[PDB]
Design a binder for these strands. Structure first.
Lengths: 261, 207, 155
RNA sequence: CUAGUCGAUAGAAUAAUGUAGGUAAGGGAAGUCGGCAAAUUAGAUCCGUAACUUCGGGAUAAGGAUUGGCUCUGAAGAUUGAGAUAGUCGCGAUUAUCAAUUAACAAUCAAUUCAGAACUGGCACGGACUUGGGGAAUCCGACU
RNA sequence: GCCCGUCGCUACUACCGAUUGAAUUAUUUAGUGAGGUCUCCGGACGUGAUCACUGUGACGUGUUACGGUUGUUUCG
RNA sequence: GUAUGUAAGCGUAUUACCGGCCGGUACUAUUACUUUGAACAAAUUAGAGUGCUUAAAGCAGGCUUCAAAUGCCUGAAUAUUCUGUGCAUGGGAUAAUGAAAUAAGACCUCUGUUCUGCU
RNA sequence: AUUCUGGUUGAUCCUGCCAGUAGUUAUAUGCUUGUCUCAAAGAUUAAGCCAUGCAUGUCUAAGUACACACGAAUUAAAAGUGAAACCGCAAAAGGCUCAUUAUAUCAGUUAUGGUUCCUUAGAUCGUUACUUGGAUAACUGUGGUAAUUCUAGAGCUAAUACAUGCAAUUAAAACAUGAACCUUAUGGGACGUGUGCUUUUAUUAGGCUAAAACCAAGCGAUCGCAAGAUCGUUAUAUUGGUUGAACUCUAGAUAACAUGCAGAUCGUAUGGUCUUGUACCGACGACAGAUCUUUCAAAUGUCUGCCCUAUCAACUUUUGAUGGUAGUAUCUAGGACUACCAUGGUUGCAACGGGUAACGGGGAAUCAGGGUUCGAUUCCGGAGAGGGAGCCUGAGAAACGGCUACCAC
């Protein structure tokens, strides 16, 4: 802590996966130290004003969150600049919104609705498995949620499924090369499955060799993986077409096929 | 004041990197304890905010551990005989970290007679032949398990003869282990095995 | 090398002669908990049964090796528990797409288990905590150390 | 101290001037032929050293700091090195190999010069004595 | 036919220069110290206990409840 | 008929094992170089889309809807200056380095005629 | 547009330039100048000086209200407003600057196992006045001063301010030891205490191939009348981690150590409970704190990569130069720095020395590439508020729209 602590963030320095504009304004929202990181989060002012487009300006947000409409993950979170990172359930019951955050094929975010049962549970990664906290055992997740006294076979670097309205774990899956995965924050980010290989670097930062369903190989470091199911067996409702990362000409194929002219 | 940074100290081949951002608040260090052995005083000061580090000045006593069991007993520090590096800390008798200090030999005698029924050390007979109240609390025969437990106990009273000479004189050496300048205590343990027989050559032969 | 020659006493901190009362008899053949780096590097056998103290030793001190790992050659070894090594690399210019022979020099610390390292032996290097004003590395393994021509042979 | 001398005309008396030994508040060469009598400097350790040089100097350059008494640790040596081990006689007496030792080992005696540090005093410090002012130039003559 | 150089005119450049020169520069050897932090100490006033001052409430007048421009030894 | 630019067999660590030719596991002298990469802010440059009236812009907007608009989305991509060093992987040409000449030629190993034992 | 053009010479061709014409967010200036879409900025010399102005506080149902300013008074409700005034946090962000600085800042990749942390949250408080003390602003009133920018005495009065701590603040229990016991043993203590949380070392186990022969208990069991020797299976040589390991971490134990701590807080909205016992109960918190995780962080390292000179060729230890080791401080590495010790780090692979009209950088302008120039200046990062230097408070400045000195004006 020295002459800071950098309580602003201007235009053009926010991560451009926010789909942030350029003109007029000269600032980013700059979220406040919430349950996720800086470049990984996606707050309410970004989503509701500019892409959900139900709040017109920033002062329009100051009513709805203070009139207690949006609650995320069961808590109301009345601060407008709550960071609201990945794999979190936007529990907006009016008019039955039920949103989550899954990264795009193009790495951005998407307006996508989930069900109310899909709002009851959620999937969450862990970073370490800790012994020493209350009383003897502990477990730390990815999103600032804590687990004391878990089942002793779930080790670190796994992804478990919890009910947010409870404090229990409902499901866990293994770290195996037959599992469905999600890349979070890499160059090849936003592809679903379908890993077959990993190579443990002897000190350090092992990258993983993840392929797709069409045989295209890709990779990233270990901090990006989000294991999202078994062999072609997800645990969520998915966004649009399956992280396939086609060519620009194939991207131009949807520019000509699904258009009226 | 003087900072603890590299504001001094020309870089690795001789030349003088001159100034570059004159001074910072956090990068400084304060005048040290220089704690003479005295009558147990203490002082409070701000640190890096939130933390309350406690320093020591004019200190008297402390608690000190044992080697083969980890038996920590509080007693009055008598004096000092030796510091590790600065003889100009020896002569002024200043309390530092792991220096050679003589302490008491008193409370370890009475504490141990449950396990060490033979009292250490061997006190002089014809003036202390009366017991106030030693001989009853040594064995007492107990008609029960605890004296019987002390039969398979007191098989570990095969301690070093040098401290047995030192216990019967009543002035044992020990090694203050903790930091006087971070917590304001004088916490340590008795040197027993190999540095005990070492440092007397550093003391008695140089006496 | 040492017969504990110091004006104080030197001992590896964290162990004590506990003599009679003990959970079982854990002799361990010496009262010296020699750790290991476990990064593929084998431990030297002399480190476990060593008499040397060396608080800054990576095997036997309060050190865990961090950072990266590299190799190279050594030139000078006069200074105590510390040798002077040398690394080589190239540089890529713009005007010519050509290269050069420049180099850096990092001074490094040695445990005495790699006793008698000379010019110009070949020594791999790994990083650790700062020791004193320059030393952030520690010697890993006398890997080759063989000059088959001028340095590494008797006469 | 050891040896030896009071031998230089005397008891008295506080005038000048002189005879020699001095200090004098300011400024400090104006004084006078002229910085000449006279004052500062003076020992030792620690640096720090300018132009010109025949490269031996100039060199003590200049320009400085430091310096008691009292209470202590740190260092520079010599002689026996120390001397296991097994038993004998009766612990006494008696008989032997030598690595580590051992850096001011273990006994013992030892000169004197250093190298620091606490504390304290006319706040004077080599306290009197011993004892140098310095600097650019000229013109000589080389020098002792 | 070009064309070489002192020399004198006239202008201009720049360098050497006695003048131990002249300003200015950013450091820096040591010579006194502002002002603070730390600290040896100091310890105004202002208290709580307390010997104790006295009333009434109390006790057996004193003590205290309640209090005093209360004074004093006590101890912080 | 022919061609050879294709893979296997065949002049041999085309590695040891369990599996159905085919998965998992025992398990390798280096560099420089290059291979695909990984990680790694934009913004700007290049720029894919795009009739802001055009441009320079900018990321807007497009839309039987014509008589109701519920009217789905496209978006805001993609790489170079996001040079470099170093951190994976492919590859074995080039470029050196690298054994076995006071003696290691080996023993795949029942293996000791060592001893360190180790639970 | 990978482009030339004129001039030597009587006339020739040549190297060699010079001149020309190109753009140039690159500033100035000259002339002209209808409409518009947009729009650089007292950087450059001079980080020079400065009249006035203004760039900073903030209140919710809910921390404290005794405001006639009053809403209200048969809701003494005071919930309105709360101006005040104590408090709560913030005032270290931004914005302005290029003057210092040269393998430094930075660029990048990169450690924190070598540290801390305001706050969101996430688990996260059964260990004798009880819901106590005293004391102050505002508010009056006496004022003062040569002074608009300061400020005394007196009368008052509160807390989510301060001081102190119980009715569950409660121990049973669990549980170590001494202890009602008594007995031969993966047998046995009734009870006194001890039982929170951190501080502190010390000790202990800290990440574990397989069979017996054999023997101390002689355990289930075996020989045996039994003692007690034999053997023998299962739970039992049962703590975590990157899982690259003394991560001395919050864990587990032993042993003591000092110093606090352990919500006496609060309103929305009241209720179940009427025994109306104001006993027992609703969600709450904008609430406070401790434990840990997390987030934004910051401050030193790690590698590679910086501009010009041989009229700088050797440098650094005065009083740290490079390492040893103990220790000090410091939030922590550490010659950071004291002391003791060694006699070293560095260099013709341009080291140390000076010099720059030199803040780095993302980046900017021109063509066929390779570029050479620069980039003060909206983005990022590092720095300064006249010259310099200490430092309070706080989590966080060595702060300057905080203070202090001196110095300048």
């Amino acid at each position: 802590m020295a002459r800071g602590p950098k309580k602003h963030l201007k235009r053009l320095a926010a991560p451009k996966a926010w789909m942030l504009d350029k003109l007029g304004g000269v600032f980013a929202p700059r979220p406040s130290t919430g349950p996720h990181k800086l470049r990984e989060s996606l707050p309410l002012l970004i989503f509701l004003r500019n892409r959900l487009k139900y709040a017109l300006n920033g002062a329009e947000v100051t009513k709805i969150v203070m009139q207690r409409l949006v609650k995320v993950d069961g808590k109301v979170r009345t601060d407008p600049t709550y960071p609201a990172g990945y794999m979190d359930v936007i529990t907006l019951e009016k008019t039955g919104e039920f949103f989550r955050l899954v990264y795009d094929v193009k790495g951005r975010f998407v307006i996508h609705r989930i069900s109310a049962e899909e709002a009851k549970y959620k999937l969450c990664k862990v970073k370490k498995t800790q012994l020493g906290a209350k009383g003897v055992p502990f477990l730390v997740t990815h999103d600032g949620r804590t687990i004391r006294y878990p089942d002793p076979l779930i080790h670190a670097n796994d992804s478990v499924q919890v009910d947010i309205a409870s404090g229990k774990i409902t499901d866990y899956i293994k770290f195996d090369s037959g599992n469905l995965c999600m890349i979070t924050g890499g160059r090849n980010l936003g592809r679903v499955g379908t890993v077959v290989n990993r190579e443990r670097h002897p000190g350090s930062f092992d990258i993983v060799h993840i392929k797709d369903s069409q045989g295209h190989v890709f990779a990233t470091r270990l901090t990006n993986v989000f294991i999202i199911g078994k062999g072609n067996k997800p645990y969520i409702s998915l966004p649009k077409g399956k992280g396939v990362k086609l060519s620009i000409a194939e991207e131009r194929d949807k520019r000509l096929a699904a258009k009226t002219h | 004041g003087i900072s603890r940074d590299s504001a001094h100290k020309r870089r690795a081949t001789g030349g003088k990197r001159k100034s570059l951002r004159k001074k910072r608040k956090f990068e400084l260090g304060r005048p040290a304890a220089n704690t003479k052995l005295g009558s147990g005083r203490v002082h409070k000061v701000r640190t890096r905010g939130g933390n309350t580090k406690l320093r020591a000045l004019r200190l008297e006593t402390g608690n000190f551990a044992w080697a083969s069991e980890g038996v920590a007993r509080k007693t009055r520090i008598a004096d000092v005989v030796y510091n590790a590096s600065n003889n100009e800390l020896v002569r002024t008798k200043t309390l530092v970290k792991n220096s050679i200090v003589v302490i008491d030999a008193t409370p370890f005698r009475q504490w141990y007679e449950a396990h060490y029924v033979l009292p250490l050390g061997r006190k002089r007979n014809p003036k202390h032949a009366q017991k106030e109240d030693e001989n009853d609390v040594l064995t007492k025969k107990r008609s029960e398990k605890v004296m019987k437990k002390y039969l398979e106990r007191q098989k570990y009273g095969k301690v070093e003869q040098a401290l047995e000479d030192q216990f019967t004189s009543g002035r044992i050496l020990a090694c203050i282990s903790s930091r006087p300048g971070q917590c304001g205590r004088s916490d340590g343990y008795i040197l027993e095995g190999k540095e005990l027989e070492f440092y007397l050559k550093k003391i008695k032969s140089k006496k | 090398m040492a017969d504990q020659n110091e004006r104080a006493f030197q001992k590896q901190f964290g162990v004590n002669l506990n003599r009679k009362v003990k959970p079982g008899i854990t002799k361990k053949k010496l009262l010296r908990r020699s750790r290991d780096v476990g990064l593929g590097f084998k431990t030297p056998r002399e480190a476990i049964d060593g008499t040397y103290i060396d608080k800054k030793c990576p095997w036997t001190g309060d050190v865990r090796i961090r950072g990266r790992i590299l190799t190279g050659v050594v030139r000078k070894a006069k200074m105590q528990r510390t040798i002077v090594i040398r690394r080589d690399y190239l540089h890529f210019v713009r005007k010519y797409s050509r290269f050069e022979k420049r180099h850096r020099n990092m001074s490094v610390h040695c445990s005495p288990v790699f006793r008698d390292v000379e010019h110009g032996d070949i020594v791999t290097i790994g990083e650790c905590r700062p020791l004193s004003k320059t030393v952030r590395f520690n010697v890993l393994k006398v890997s080759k150390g063989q000059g088959a021509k001028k340095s590494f042979k008797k006469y």
